[PDB]
Every structure is written in C-alpha cells, then in structure tokens.
Design a protein around this nucleic acid. Sequence first.
RNA 1: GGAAAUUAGGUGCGCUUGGCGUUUUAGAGCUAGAAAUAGCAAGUUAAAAUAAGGCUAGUCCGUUAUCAACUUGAAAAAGUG
DNA 2: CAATCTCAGCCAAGCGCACCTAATTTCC
DNA 3: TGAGATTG
Length: 1319
Amino acid sequence: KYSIGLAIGTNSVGWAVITDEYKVPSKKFKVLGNTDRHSIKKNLIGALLFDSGETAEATRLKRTARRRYTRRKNRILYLQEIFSNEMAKVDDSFFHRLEESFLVEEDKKHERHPIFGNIVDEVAYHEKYPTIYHLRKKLVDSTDKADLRLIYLALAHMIKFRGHFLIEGDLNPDNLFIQLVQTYNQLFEENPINASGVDAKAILSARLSKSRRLENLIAQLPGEKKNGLFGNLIALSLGLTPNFKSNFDLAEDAKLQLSKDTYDDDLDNLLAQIGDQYADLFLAAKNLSDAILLSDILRVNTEITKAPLSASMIKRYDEHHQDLTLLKALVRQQLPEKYKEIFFDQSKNGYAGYIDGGASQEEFYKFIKPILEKMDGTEELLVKLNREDLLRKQRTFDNGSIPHQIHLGELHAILRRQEDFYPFLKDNREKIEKILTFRIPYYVGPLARGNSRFAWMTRKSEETITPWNFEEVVDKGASAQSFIERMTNFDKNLPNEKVLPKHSLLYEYFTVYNELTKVKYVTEGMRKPAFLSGEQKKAIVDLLFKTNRKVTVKQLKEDYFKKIEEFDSVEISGVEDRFNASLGTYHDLLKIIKDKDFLDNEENEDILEDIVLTLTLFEDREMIEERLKTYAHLFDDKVMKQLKRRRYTGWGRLSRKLINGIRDKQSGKTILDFLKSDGFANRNFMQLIHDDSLTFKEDIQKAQDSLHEHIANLAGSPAIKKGILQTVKVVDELVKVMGRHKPENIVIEMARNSRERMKRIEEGIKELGSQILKEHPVENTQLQNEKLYLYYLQNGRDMYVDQELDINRLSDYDVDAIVPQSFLKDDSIDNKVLTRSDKNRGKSDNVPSEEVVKKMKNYWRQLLNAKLITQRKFDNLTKAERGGLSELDKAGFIKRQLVETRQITKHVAQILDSRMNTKYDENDKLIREVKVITLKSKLVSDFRKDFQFYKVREINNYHHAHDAYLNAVVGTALIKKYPKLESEFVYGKATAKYFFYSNIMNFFKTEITLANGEIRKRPLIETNGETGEIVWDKGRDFATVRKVLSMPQVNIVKKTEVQTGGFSKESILPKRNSDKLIARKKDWDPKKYGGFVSPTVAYSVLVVAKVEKGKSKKLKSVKELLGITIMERSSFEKNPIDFLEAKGYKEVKKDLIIKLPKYSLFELENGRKRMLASAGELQKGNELALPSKYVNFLYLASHYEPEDNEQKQLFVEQHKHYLDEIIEQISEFSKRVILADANLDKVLSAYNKHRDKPIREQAENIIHLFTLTNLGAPAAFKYFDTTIDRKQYRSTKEVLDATLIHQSITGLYETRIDLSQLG
RNA sequence: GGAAAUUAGGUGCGCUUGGCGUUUUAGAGCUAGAAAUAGCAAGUUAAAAUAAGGCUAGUCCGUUAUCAACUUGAAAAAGUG
DNA sequence: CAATCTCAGCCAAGCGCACCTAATTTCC
DNA sequence: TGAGATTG
Ligand SMILES: [K+]
Ligand SMILES: [K+]
Ligand SMILES: [K+]
Ligand SMILES: [K+]
Ligand SMILES: [K+]
Ligand SMILES: [K+]
Ligand SMILES: [K+]
Ligand SMILES: [K+]
Ligand SMILES: [K+]
Ligand SMILES: [K+]
Ligand SMILES: [K+]
Ligand SMILES: [Mg+2]
Ligand SMILES: [Mg+2]
Ligand SMILES: [Mg+2]
C-alpha cells in the first residue's frame, strides 16, 4: 500500500512515495554499466528539473520574417525580368554588378563601380545625386529622357522599401480653414469665429504634441475655449478623438475619429441627435483634413513638385549640410580641442560616432546638447535638437509612418515621365505599379503547393502565382472561406453543423427568447407570479426589443405592463436592470435597409441569414459586395453601399439546425418555437434538450488523440504544459518501481510588461486628457515599481479620498487591498490601490465602506472609462452599495483557498484518473481504484509554518521534493479524517460553511486558540469517527515527517536535453582573422566579409580516435569531447564517420561514440559532480544537503521581523553558533565539490567583516551564499555589499576520465560508465 | 460537474505587412614628407545578405513541441532492474 | 594557464479563430 | 549564461 505526492511546476516535478505510516520507503536498485557498483540504495523521493518549455511565438515571428525577405527579393526579381531585354541593350552586366556589389574587388567578376562600370561616371552620379531621393525627385519632375539604369534604381528603391498598408484607398497629396471657419460661422450664425490672420498651416503642422497645437490654435481665437465646440473639432482635422457630450448638452458620450471606419456611422448617430443642419461642419472639417493629413511626413509644398516625400528627404539633407557647416565653424572658433573628439573619434557619441560608429540619433543628441548649450550662436541648432530635427539622416527609425501610396505616387510619376521614351515601360506600367501595391491577403496565407503545414489557399488554375495573375489564379473566395472554416467551432450538440455567426438574427432571437421565457411577473390580485405567455412575449418583442436596442426593466414595466396590461404596479423576476440579450443586428439592418416589414417577414429569413453570414465570413468589402449581388435587385444602390460596409466578427455557440431546424416529433416545434411559446411551462434551452418527453435529447444523442497531442491541445502556458507531461512519465515510472501495483492516492498540487504598463498609462491619461505625464515624465522601467505604477494609474490621486497624492512621498503612502487579502489571495493590480492611509478605506472587515463609494464612485468611473482600472476592479471597489461582502461571500472565499478551481489542474487530475482507473463494475460504473486528490499550495504552506517544517528555496532543490511529500501526507490524512471531503478534493449555514472550512485543518493541532477567543484541546491520536481507524498520531507521525525532510539523499535530476533553435548569435560582426567567425553564405569568407560568432552546441559526442600531429601528420590517439552545433547536426547524423573524418579524426571507434546532451552528468573524486554546460564548459553537479536544524534556523533568523515569536526569538539567540556552523558546512562542501578557492576566500573574508551585524541581516545574507553551492550554472552573488563574481568551469577535459551517469526520469535507475576505461 | 447570455480582462495558434540595425562593396579624399606621421577636407546615400541552406522547386520549407541508457528492430515502436 | 572584461537583433501595424478567469441572469 | 577577447 502506498500513495504518490506530486508538485507540478514550470521548471520542476517534485515527487514522493509514502506508506500508510507517512514514511518514504527506500530500496536497492540495480546499477548498470562497467563500474564496480552493482546496486545502490535510494529513497523514494525526488524532483525532476527542466529548462522552461517555450511557446511557438518566437518561431512564428522568424517564419514570417523569412517569408517577407523571400517575397521582397521576388518583387525586385519581377522588376528586373521586366527590364531584362531592354537593359541588355544599354548595359548587359548592370544587374550582374548589382548582384555582386557585396563582393570584394578580388572576388568580383565585373568592374567595381555598380551603376556605370567606370569611376568618372560613378563619381559624377553621386555628385549630382548625393541621395537616392535627389534622383527620385529629378525623375518625377524632369521631362528629359533618362538613363535606363537610373530609372531602374529609382523604381527598385520604391518597390524594395514600399511603405505601409494601413490606409485604405487612394491618396493624392495636395497642400479650407477659411471655409470651415466660414462654415461654422454660417451654421452658428449668431456665434461666428474670426480666423483672419491665423496661420493655420504653421500652428497645426508644428512638430509639437497635438495636445499643444490645440492650445496654440485656440490662443489665436479670442472668445473660443479649447473645450468649446470648435476647439473639440480642431482635434478632428488633427487626428485625436474627443467627446462632444457637453457641446450639444448630450446625455451619452459620442466621440469621433475620421480615420476610423465607424466614422460615417457615429457621425450619423450624432447627427440624428443634433440635427441634419450640422452636416457641413464635419464636412468642412473632413475637407481640411485631406490637405494636412500627411503634413507629418510631407514638409514641402506640393505645387512645386510631384515628389514631396523625396523633396522632404532632400530638405533633411540640405539642412544637415548647412548645419554641419555651421557646427564645424562654431566648434573651430570656440572649442577646437573638442573638434577631434566630435568629428573623428568613432568611439564617442559625437558626429563621427553618429555617422561612422554606433551612435543612434538619440545618443548623438544627448552627447552634443551640452556642447551646443556651452557655445554661442547655437540657438537655432538647439531648437532643431529639441524638435528632434537636427543633422538628420534620411533612412531613419521614424519612416514607418510613410504610407505606400506616397511611394506609389512617385513611382507612377516616373513611369509617366519615362514611358514616353521607352515603350516597354508603357506596356508594363500597371504591371510595375502592381509589384509595389500588391499584398497577399492575410486570409489567403502562404501560396503553397502541397508542402506547407500552414497553408490553406486553393487555386482556380494550376500555374505559378504572380502579383498580376493573383486574382485569376488564386480562388480568393474559397481560400477566405477555408481560412475561417478550418478554425470555427462546430455545434457540440450537432457536431457536423457549424455554429451560427454571433450576429445572426436567428441567433439573437434565440438569445432574447431564451432570457424572456424565464421572466415572471406578479401584481396585486395574482395568487402567484406568472410566466409570460407566447402572446405576451411576442408583444414584448414587437413593442420593445424591435424598437429599442436595449430593453430596461423600467420600460418593460412602464411601456408594456402599464400601457398594455394596465398594471400600475408589477414585480418582475428573471431580469435585473435591463435584459442582457438584445436584437442588435435587427436594429443595425433597420438603419441600413429602412424596411421594417422586410425584416419582420418570415419569408426573408434565409436571405437575411445569408447576408449576415457573408458579412461575418468575409472582411474584404469587394468580396462582400460580390457575394451580396444575388440580392442586389432587392435594395437600392445606396442601401447596397451601406450594407457592404456593415461588417461583423465572431461566431456563436450553437448551429441553426439546433436552434430552429430539428423538430420535436410529437409537436413539430423547433427549439425556437418552444422558446416563443411553450404552454405554461416556458421551458428554456437547457430544459428542452434535457426533457425525456421531447425528442431533442435523443436526436442530440444520435448526432454525437494521443496523450502528448491531448496535453499539447490544452489551454494554458506551454511552460506549465511541459511539467504536466513529465508528471505523467514520473507516475508511470514510480508505478513500475512499486511492482506495477497502483497507488491508493495520488495527491497533486500545481504552482500558482514594462512596455505594456507604459502603453496602458499613455492610452489612459490620453483618455482623461490629464497633463500628469507632462508634469511628471516616466520611463517604462520605472513603472515596475508597484506604488509608482499605482500613482499613474490613479492620475496621481488617492483612491479613497478626493485629493492629489505627492509623487515624492510614495514611501509614506499605503498599498491597500480592495478585497482584504485575508479573504481572497489577489496581490495583482486588479485588487490593489494607492492611498495616503489605508485607515481611510473604512473598516478592515469588508470592502471599502459605503461612504467612500459615495464619494469616489464618479472618480472611479472615469478611471474605468480610461481603462486605468478594470470592470472587475470597479465592481469590487463599489461592492458596499450592493450589500458589501455577505456571509456566503466570505465562506466561498475561504473555500476557494482550499479547493482548486483552475481548469488546467482539473485536466491533470482527469488525465491521471483515467490512466489509473480503467475497469468497470457490474453496473458499468467506473471503478476508482486510485483516488486523485488535488490540493492548493496554501494547505501545505500553512502546514509547514504551523509545525516548523520551514522552506528555504535558495539552499538547494530539495524543497520541490519535500513539497510533493507533504502533499501526499496532508492529502491522504485529510480525506482519511473527513471522507466526505472527497466530493471536494477527489476527481470524479453560510457561517457554518465558513467556520467549517476555516477549521478543517485543526485536527493536526493539539491546542488550538480559536478566533472565537477560546482554546480547544485534542488527543494525541486523531481518528475517523465512523471507522475508528487511526489517521494521525501527534506522537509519531510528526517525527516521521522530520525524519523525511532531514534525509540527505534526495533524487534530484536535471533533465538532459538536446539544444535547438538559432544556429548562433545573430549579430554580423566585421571581418577579423580569428577562425571563430562563421560564414553567412557559402562563399563569403569571414576574413573578407565578417560573419557570426558563438554557434550553439546541439549536443556533444565522445570521440575516441586519432588525429594528425605536426608537419609529419603522424597519427596520435586522442579521446575528445566534440560539440556538434545545431547547424552541423543533420550532417553529423546523416553520416557520423564521414563528418568526424572531415573534422580531422581517423580510425574512429564507432561503437564508442557517446551522445552527450546538455546537463549530461559526471562523477569525479570525493563525490564531486559536474554537468555538461556544452562541449567546453561544465556546471555544478552537487546538492548541498544542509541539516534541517540549520534550514529552520535560517528561516526563523532571516524572518526576524502570537507570543510564540518571543519563543522563536529566544531560540535564535541560544543558537547563534549555527551561523559559523553553516559557514563551515558551506566551506567543507565548497572545498570538496565546488573548487573555487578564490571566491571561497572572498566569502569567508566577507563573513568575518560583518560578524558585528545584526543576526537577521547575517542570516539574510548567508542565504545568498548558497549561490556558490547551488546545482547548475555558476552565478554571481552578494554578501551585504561585497560582490562575488562567478567562477565558470571552462574546461571539460576532466570528465573524459570520470564516471558518466545515465539516469532515468526519477533518477532511480542508473547506468554508470567509467570513461577512464576508454582510450 | 455542466450550458446559453451579458460584462470585462487574459492566454494560445496562425496569417499578412511597415521601419531600423548590421555586414561587404560603391560614393576618385587633398597637401607636406623618403617614411613614421602631421595639417586639412569629407560625412546624410546605395547595392546585396538577414539563420548555412533544402527538395518537394512552391512567390514553398528551415529556431515550438517531444529526447537517460540498454535490447530487438534501419524506422515506428516494444521490452529490461 | 588564470582572472577579468565583454557581449548578446530591435521597433511597429492589421486580421482570424480557439481557450481561460470572474462577476451577473436563467437552467441541466 | 555560454563564450570571444583581453589582461595578468
Ligand atoms: K576582379
Ligand atoms: K482663446
Ligand atoms: K555603423
Ligand atoms: K551611428
Ligand atoms: K542606413
Ligand atoms: K441584466
Ligand atoms: K467580417
Ligand atoms: K436594385
Ligand atoms: K527543443
Ligand atoms: K530552449
Ligand atoms: K534522464
Ligand atoms: Mg524588412
Ligand atoms: Mg534566403
Ligand atoms: Mg538599411
């Protein structure tokens, strides 16, 4: 008889076997191999450790980048093939010189000047066109016939770096304010605005923040304020999104943004409230928006050139030239000694490091700003620097905002200019434009032909896909439909039927009637509440749901029960405040098609389901239009135009066949039929499909993956999922260890941004319109501090008092839990706030008091509408106005502290239970031979603290194994003592439940001082009340637990793993002579071209062979560890002997080759162990088994800050000698297996310096000292403020004559190989 | 233990795109001097590569998951204390 | 050799589906 | 945290 405890973590599976006396057995296991040792004794406790499992995300991002480099290359190849025949007439090696431009002169086949093949023409080109943008602008604007090579380069530059696809439709740069002002002045005839003299271009296109230009513009309009109507508008032409609630005395918030696709509908929503007369106001706002949309990137008047982007780059270049000339002149006059540093030293962040070295524009500015402020005549240079507009390059990090339409306009213009001289440019103009503009639709995916596991695209024609034949060769419709249909759920009830669109009319009718049919009403004179009849539900749907998007309970009472039923008073149950379900799509389509009778006519149901399906399935408006054309004769062209813009996303949970297809045989009614009208029973969906007197249940019944696949397909981090599969393998091994007898119980416990924080605070303060970021700028790395993050999330105010907080006094402020942490175990931002003093929350018993909620609710709602708090956080803050925390709330919170509710942990329980329990009884009921028990970590955590079995994670890895053991002990004892708990813990009144779960663990204790101010005593022996069988003996089972935790032999196994992933570090380093550099392409010698460093070793191999020595090349026998790199691995595995001989080995002992992945384990002298870090470095291989008295002493001494504390304090003082004893434990261990005497000397030295320090601080820093002794990779650590750097073991030679240890997953089965016998 | 709806927040898998960076080459450096060097001039741009590569030859695929040893099997797998 | 110093690809956009958690109404 | 290079 035995049980298994398991502790499942992100990097470990702890495990232990226990008997019915809570003991861990030990056993002799066979030892295989070639050593002296035939067997060894092992305790049945241990922990498997592993590197974290990784998600597929990084791999996915690299796969996308590969496709985009492939396709970018093909864009150029398309362009060159078009130019091929005519370029051969001008210069038959021009494309060859382009392709070999990277090669050193000695390697080149053609002359080294790429464009023209000779130095005088090449020099003349750069003199006339210092940047590509000079050429582009020249070719756009000039009427001269141009050299075909210069045409090619300009078009290639645009196609290769073609700009983004975030703006739909066409752009035509044309560089209105007088009219809009005159418009507003007319539409508000009594309150006009005078805009005479206002330079609207200079104010709005200023480089400043949009929030600032609003101020500047309004400053020029006396009588207008920034929050006035015209002020709120200026942001619309600008690009912000403000709310016009107070402008029009509105009741609901209504904002608008021109670039959003919802603009025409929100403007329609707003105009319906404010009146059609306001059409010309937002219309003139939209007209002005066109000419100044691209003013951020186009800084040139579009009347003097058709290439304002290139002209803007040229303006960068010219100002750079002018300002560089000035900067050099000023420096020569005032600071000459700095000239050499600024303009020659590439290692400094001056101009030299900016141009030739590695200084970014940001690092260059910071370096040169104090030099500018120090000198005279640099006022204009300083303004440009602060505008981030000084000595600018033209290829820069901020060019991501250029839309492809801008590059397209210059491309089109060059083609128009030069097609007059080259007929092939006229015949291929649209082809070339297609190369720039064509984008593979994301709903089509990779253009594969049977060899891509990622692709779903299908072809209308079996031929090669180009940008010009894409629409004709690819079946866009089938591919877009496949895109969605491969992913969407089927109806679990009818598993061959796809779920309906979430926005289907039928689906929403289903939702509305399912909710409505369970409403009840009662009025004075009714004996009892009544369901609504079919006729009343139809009246409510027709009168309320089909006239209002949302239906409140007040409208139900006033507009139905008063108006129709003639009730003055009525009590409603089944719905609170408002119905959750609504007919959103009905009202959407009513606005569009303006034909209520059409919507209400049942004969149109198929048409309208197909329309919404098309609007849900497809995202492309032209594909939607194409698919809607069967219905074109039904609607006006104007309606059709609005319908194709009405997109929906999202899928329901149920199919059309289920909700309104299958019929009950006796009645002939569908499910929706019953929801509309079901006598006086009003059965809802759950009742209908479970009712044995209907045929829905049997028809749903008639309509109705390996382990690794199953685990992989679970929701939850790939990290925790790695531990789950290892857990199953640990259990399988332990069962085999136990003679294939199954355990009685298996007890399982499963363990429980900087950029994102800045984005939430930026987006949230922009929503509030607050200037807190301007007053108190922050860096994303700072927002990792809890109190500073809360400060900005609360707009610098107290959450419980209507007052600002002082940002420089956060150490005096409190972080309080909204729901007190004594009830719920939430320490996240969603349950914490920053307040001056937590006493102002109200009482500590509950949620923040009612008075606080009354005062702060409106301020809390503004944070909620800014997403600075979540809805969950708001509901907990305002809970007091809904009764606060009730008695059931408290019981549930204490229950949830005990009973695991996570689905992922239930999945682990289910997996183990279905692997252990496989037999059925006489009633075909499952036979539960093994009870799978799930515990939360708090149970064992409190057990450890209550009975002084303390845990110090930094000492070694044993705490994972000790956890699993205590899980087994506490879990089996718990259900032995209270077998009724099995419903709660085994897979397969309010105050009383509160008191019960608060005291369920009392039976372990002898004397319990209850919270009720009383003390209770229990006997030495705890028993089950029904059976009398002994469960716990406080005179022997606690000592047994001590004998378990103090055992030094714990099977800790670091999972050996082949390394995978990137070939090497990614940086391309410049050329050097060191043979370390790796070629980036087959024929790119790193001595000429640079290359990569640091290949990653996939695994090492032991090689016993011979190598050639000296000029004589005489053969010498060697035994070596060879690191096989990731890049080499396929070639090595394809033919190991041929690979090894190419490396220089001869007469390899083929049968002696040993594959040695990372963490391969070796034992040397005196028990010292090492693991392979690679082929050239080792890791520490031992665990320091510190005695239990020292572990408990460290815990108590390090946590020095009931009246048992005085007893714990006295114990620390009486055992002050343990500190030196622990240092001697570390020293002996380190001298035996660590062998880092310089670091150890530095540690003993540092420990002697601080013997005068308080005991708590010494014990605190002693815990750090175990980094020297820990298993695994060496790592630096600190003792007080003396830093000990790491000692790496950068030689593997010694393991070549050591003992190699192959371990099974538990480490219980070993094969030991004495490598000294090899050679 | 489940289901539908509402509200909100997370996570995973997949697709399509934009901008940098880096590397080598091209962008005639000048004057003095035998040279070492010194005094100046100049600088903003481009091509090409962006896992080596692969066969299945596609505008495809190439970094996730999974892995002690031994044995009988090329392989999948199965067995061994 | 050792001890010590040094280094590490990054920033951004849009879209689809599927899960999970946590509160509310109604049910099985 | 493996490993390239420089300093001792
Ligand atoms: K040559
Ligand atoms: K004003
Ligand atoms: K550089
Ligand atoms: K630079
Ligand atoms: K560049
Ligand atoms: K409601
Ligand atoms: K859609
Ligand atoms: K029509
Ligand atoms: K892997
Ligand atoms: K990895
Ligand atoms: K292993
Ligand atoms: Mg790119
Ligand atoms: Mg390639
Ligand atoms: Mg570049």
